[model samples]
Target: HLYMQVQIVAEDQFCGHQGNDMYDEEKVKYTVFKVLKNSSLAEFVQSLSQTMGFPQDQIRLWPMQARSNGTKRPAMLDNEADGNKTMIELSDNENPWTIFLETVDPTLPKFDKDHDVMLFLKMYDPKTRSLNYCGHIYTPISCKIRDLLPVMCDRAGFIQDTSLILYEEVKPNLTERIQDYDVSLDKALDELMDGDIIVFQKDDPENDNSELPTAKEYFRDLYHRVDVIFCDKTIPNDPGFVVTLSNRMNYFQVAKTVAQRLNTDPMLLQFFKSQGYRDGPGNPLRHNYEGTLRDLLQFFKPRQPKKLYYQQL
Candidate 1:
């Protein structure tokens, strides 16, 4: 689980390229809090903030480094004042925590989407046996769906206002066709910047409050909702980039689109037929297309590391 807060202050200065100087404008600062099983994610979150212009001091938490056993050993904030202001005191009781704070220009409206907002993005990751989830909000700038897409969808279609959001149900029989995909920090960032598809499972909010559901179940519910959302609606069939987390719905939805383009029902596609895919039990295919899905999407990615951390400058 993760939590975040942002305070937009009305203060700004423009430093000239030649030397120390001053311009005028209010800056927005953001603070993010994380509660998870490991600190690697917190570190990653902090690094993301830094890359986006937040200062090191603004990113807080005790024991910034991890121990030899892979446990995060937070650096204790020395002064009570800093601790109080950054909310470090509350973290000890929380355990496995991290904080991020930073300033932005043209201060956004406080507590308003135009100025402030909060959101949660969570999903199951089979490879890691944990959930990859986070919640964040705009510090100084208003956060619209637009603000997040660039961070998560690297392809060009995601930002296309016309990009269609699709979904399809998943069941045991069709489990064989579920695709295997991976989204690294760099890949997600790039796709987001490029406006690719932004996919997520629409889990039962109530279920999330209790036991965490399996990736398949989470995606199944999401697909049912998406199907309902797009019923009888052929969203503009515009050329768009694709983005999907590693999940059943993500895989099936993409396949459905391909099936549509190929003039075939998703259930009747050659891949589906050859694999004997079905939505429930008594199906011949089960967990066999994972590698196939990876292969199909491999050409969509760059062959080399497009950019490194230092390359941002």
Candidate 2:
């Protein structure tokens, strides 16, 4: 009998992080399942289900490509369309043969289907001492924190394993306190509440209070439509480069559209808080590419002629 290794991946597409580091692979938990190469995909899945104590009917196997695009296709195992070959027989260079299991009926509890809820997230930049407002993500109550990261941030080119999503606040006593709560992706969502501020930060081992907020106070429910100025910092006295965007537009969209109008590459541009050609925040503003403009404006709400600096990446 030939032994093959099988990996279990989370079904939620958002759980995967596309990054350059091998160690920074997708956040989805995985385990090796050894099986005979001669075994069929069905037999392997059945054995895995039985071993894991999950319903066999809910388990599914999907073939994947190792290319940068990370393409995936359904595996055909039931029929003999190809001369009734088993998994081992079909294994060849054409098929890298790596497979992932998907659970049709994930054991995770479902959110309240009757009512819809909105989750608001915000990111704080310690360097700037500004809390950038992330937009509201309308999701079912059943959504877990793990599934919400990609929705609130851009996982395209960065490693997420070193990032932390935290729920923080300062109490009425004026005494500051912070705690890191580990969120289980498989655990059902039940503790989250409305008007909560979730902070995302790149993990910094050097700072002991990396999880703590910079200030005791933060912006809440600061949503509005406004005109923001955007200009390249490399070029001086650049005018008529302003664009009107709502707080609803994400930074990715903002960068794309702004870059299109300015005839520049969005990928090489980093945004900073500014005021009419002068820097507003001392440091560059950090924002999730997928997060909305409104989410980024929470710190500077009710301010007119909101200015921003665009610098080369």
Candidate 3:
């Protein structure tokens, strides 16, 4: 239910950071909407202008924060793929993320989102009651549900041979397992306009296991956004680093690379698993761990406050 971004947001943070000189973020408001696609931005812009009782303007927008590094300048949202790729690139899967407006600009394309529908894709783990946000895409009405297969497969780490059955949770706990890959996503639902929670799971055996995706298959420079808390915080209030792990890289490789950069004993670096509904502390990750770098990072879920700490006796 918690899908929309707040109407009021911080000023000196990502969206407001471009020219903000203040040390701390201030409060300003931007009426937000669910922009499911690139052209959808303009559609919403026109509608918002009417709602806001203002003239049609090209209010500039800051695209989603850089895929990893926070301080990197965010490019203005002008690409269709930006709505697809970077917006959901290892995203936390929250909907209705961000926005703003100014005078109409020539940079934005004049197009209508005549057929786009926002689809929220997820791979549900029933045992854990957690939804692994596969990715979101503005699937055009002209496309079939099968077109979503590759993207969802890659994001959720599903293998092609591992056939999946899809479900749509248009209501709480009420499910509709639409088994047609050729059918339209909109037709799969009673009605699909924008924002529907579509889930994927195994059918015949009633299983929920998506094996670790190989780097070659669904190539991505996926990373771990680790927020390490230092015993010595004399440097920066927040201390952490991003590790772009290679596909199939093992546990030992991760420890060494991290400890090598952190300038600490890998033996003493205790990595913590992040919980979806909670924050901080968990099983200490040791050197003898046996999973791939991809496996090891499950604990470091995107957008979670993964405050990994160092250890000492």
Candidate 4:
């Protein structure tokens, strides 16, 4: 399982850049992360091997660089370009998570558990507006004993509100307060408050599995402690700007992926044709993000069952 977010800053472009055709650009930035739910490093590694269908030795983790950091600026007026021409990029500032399932041996049983997960948590320092990160707290089922998620969800009836919360890092040390509060993803879904934000105490290496507190886990734990309240009675509207941004970003990713694969850009597809600029699928170069979503969503449907259960009278 993986969770991530991207913050987009566009200068010469908008969310959809088909029609603009502005070559005036600099670079794009995007953040990605993987989280696992094994509390212990050994077990987490075991599960990762299973999920990826690879041996432990074959897998490797590495840190990602901020490619656009300290880059040059382009100009807008002349061919030489002013230092003012701005380009848009995206950054992931949320705690993202994932689970790896690899088979170690043929005789061994498949390892599967939803909570044994990983996450990427986005943290910020108010003083400098700087970013900090953490997470990937593995608690092998054998080590810890906690089950608060089912209770909360049953009470909430899957119709309650939700919010993303951030917590303050108790200390500067990497292995501090944040690591101590790892919780289940289900709990995060139930306990978020209206305006709460989840913050992490430190930055975990991009692919560290040595019991670090990831941003995703930090926020999920925060969401588990509070309740999200909403006056609008809408699930998506309960939270503030951050939540809104998170939801839209998720929707956009899914929409974009499916649209591209089907050879129909979200903006120019049939159903979505009405939502934005009506460009034909052939000339997907046109603009119409709204229309694209409409067409793209046509792919959503229920799955068929392998077998039906019924009682004969």
Candidate 5:
């Protein structure tokens, strides 16, 4: 029997609700499961229902994808589907490998409306034989292509690379729906949703993450040791000074500290917009006056020996 690690991510709205007392607001939710890889999808759901003490008929499963163009249909796994075959054996190369477990009971308001659908997107990591929680996003029936990016960036905790392609899956053909919107950082948000399964993928298929990084790893490497440069553009022929910042500082806190060091007015100081890296003078992408040091670092991963630039507003 193949050992499998199953992750059961609940809707963010249902995160803290009690399973036994569905009306209880104080209890935390269950988000993971462990099972045999050899079990059929139907068998797995049956086992999950028993373990969670929920009726078998109320549970539903949908295969999901992290990056898609919103053109795919919801690939539901029902009892009619091979109820006897192993889940892995039943999944196809054409379909998303991740499974989303949800409740369909009509009495639950959150599960009643299609427009209110919130999904827990996850993927099966073959290396570990387990499902990994990729991230979750809101997919209102009226959600646009552009509306998805910010939600993804915010939830995933990093800016999406421009090189990735978005695709949507539909009933007739799983692979035919490619995002036709004008693909730009800010231009594609208005396109209407056309499919249910949106898949985001890098241009190169083999470039998939071999190992996923944890929150601790991400924090240690990127968020902890941030370097900032306080530039007084108001001072003619002034060379910017550097300050190493810890995760404790927010934008206002960093500005205050920089003001104390430069002996300038903290009220007049403005942080520079992150522009990856360059040899010549770089442009300020935008002003950053909020968020913690960690938020800034995660938003923009500066080149080696990272630094932030600031000037008088």
Candidate 6:
């Protein structure tokens, strides 16, 4: 079976520049990933991580409403269903399915079996601006308001919350302070649509500082770029196509993508560091299905290259 495409673009690119554009169809640059239709949401993320060189945890996936300028930013920011569902389900088996990829706060709570919903946070940052998007964390519907207060405080970096307050952004400029923690997150959702953003207000009216980290700094990741040489036959390695990969990349890990690019079934392939034909042909890549590649082996330097010969398994 042929693999399908999944396109990815920067979150800001999708939500900002083209989101409110004059044109009916929004335009953007995309990094296309070849993914199997049956792949899990996590596997799709793995392929994307391989392509973008981002840690899966540091990435956030937003399902988009194609070409819709009316889409709400906060509403589309992060949704539990979009992140938890599989490739086929989200894309509806469509071609070149696109998703918005943004760096996420690694310190934030993750969506898990228990925590299926997210609570977004915003806080005042006088040094920069006001009502800055701090980041978000996942919590369960059963999450109680009182029990969640400390968790919110912990997530907001409000170490000393003796003077902290919570407010719901009712709509843009208007907000209502949440003085009750006796309710449940589920019950609270009754008044909200999509999701909610709870603001952190400091009691220091004189110097009301959120003392929170900037969103820019929160979603950060550094990469170590490395290139892989796929020595395929027909093209005679044809100036030999190569791909630049970042972060922890595996020898066999990339074998999958090479298979995609080469239009060969991954299962039918074998990779080797050497070619078998001594007359100038082969050496086995020694099935590095494990190891240094697992630890992200051998890049020597940024420009250093590694080659792998492809053969039918």
Segments in model 3 whose C-alpha atoms lie over 4 Å from true places: 1-111, 203-313
Preferred candidate (lDDT higher): 1 or 5: 5
| lDDT agreement with native, every candidate | 0.31, 0.50, 0.48, 0.28, 0.46, 0.54
Candidate 4 local Cα displacement, residue 45, angstroms: 16
lDDT of 3 at 41: 40
Q: Which parts of model 1 have CA positions greater than 4 angstroms off?
A: 1-88, 95-114, 118-159, 166-313
Which runs of model 6 end up more than 4 angstroms from their true locations? 1-43, 54-89, 92-115, 125-129, 151-157, 170-174, 190-195, 207-313
Off by over 4 Å in 2: 12-28, 68-83, 93-96, 105-313
lDDT of 1 by residue, 1-313 (tens): 4443322221121111111011111232333433333333345446556555665444433223333432222233334443223333334434433332224452422343233223223334333324333223332222334345444332322243332222111121121111322333223222121101123332234444544244544444433321111111122432332333332344465557655654667665432222112221122333245544333333232221111000000
**Per-residue C-alpha lDDT of model 2 across residues 129-211, encoded as one tens digit per residue:** 45555544446654556666665555223355546535433111121223423344223332333323344544455444444
lDDT of 3 by residue, 1-313 (tens): 4233423122222232111111112344455554443333446547666765555543434333332322222224555543434332323353545432333322333323466665656665444433565534556777898888777777777676566667765442245677678987667786664445566754334333333222111112122322333332233344555554454667677667767777777675665543334544455566666776556445554443333444432
Candidate 3's clash total is 4
Question: Residue 186, candidate 5: how far off, in angstroms?
Answer: 25
lDDT of 2 at 67: 37
What TM-score does prediction 1 earn? 0.21
Cα shift from native, residue 24, model 6 (Å): 17
Model 4: per-residue Cα lDDT over 1-313, one tens digit each = 3333212222212122211011113333322224332233444346555754667765433212222322122111111222322111111222322112212233333222333332223343322333333222233333321232222223323222322223422212211222233554334422221111234322324324523234344333332221111111122333321111121233355335435644566553321211122322222222334432224323333121011011110
Order the candidate numbers by lDDT, best to worst.
Answer: 6, 2, 3, 5, 1, 4
lDDT of 3: 0.48
For residues 201-278, what per-residue lDDT tens digits would candidate 6 score against the true structure?
455554534243322211111124446566554345345778766446565567677778878887777765443223
Q: Which ten-residue region of model 3 has the weakest summed lDDT?
A: 16-25
Model 4 CA deviation exceeding 4 Å by range: 1-115, 140-185, 188-198, 201-275, 279-313
Query: In angstroms, how far off is 159's CA in candidate 5?
Result: 39
Error of 6 at 54 (Å): 5.1
